[PDB]
Design a protein around this ligand. Sequence first.
Ligand SMILES: Cc1cn([C@H]2C[C@H](OP(=O)(O)O)[C@@H](COP(=O)(O)O)O2)c(=O)[nH]c1=O
Ligand SMILES: [Ca+2]
Length: 129
Amino acid sequence: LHKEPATLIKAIDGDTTKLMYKGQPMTFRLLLVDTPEFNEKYGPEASAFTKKMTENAKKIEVEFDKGQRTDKYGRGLAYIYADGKMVNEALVRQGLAKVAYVYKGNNTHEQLLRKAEAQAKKEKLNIWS
Ligand SMILES: Cc1cn([C@H]2C[C@H](OP(=O)(O)O)[C@@H](COP(=O)(O)O)O2)c(=O)[nH]c1=O
Ligand SMILES: [Ca+2]
């Protein structure tokens, strides 16, 4: 896989963001994770976490996987990086997202994220508290 440039347009919630990619506004949905909705327990915390990480970033990048690049809603499906650190993985490591929606052929970082989830669960963090 490879990283490509994007810039943040606006934060949305814990697992969706509005980015400009190849010069066009797109909503991205983070591959392989599920944050709580804002109206759910840890939803506000997840939204705040992804907002901080993406707004504070000097450099946002998107990394598509090998399979579909947009979902049925027209959201881009990618791994999102903020100054080289993957937002998807960070969310899972802090217990603010579960590994979820692992479809065959867009699951390159599955095991990295599962290892993070295991550490978050061992630490009884947030969703695992
Ligand atoms: C993460 C992800 C979600 N989706 C679709 C499946 C779910 O359909 P349904 O809307 O029919 O439940 C929805 C979950 O996204 P959200 O968690 O943002 O709601 O997004 C994909 O199709 N591919 C993906 O990789
Ligand atoms: Ca969600």
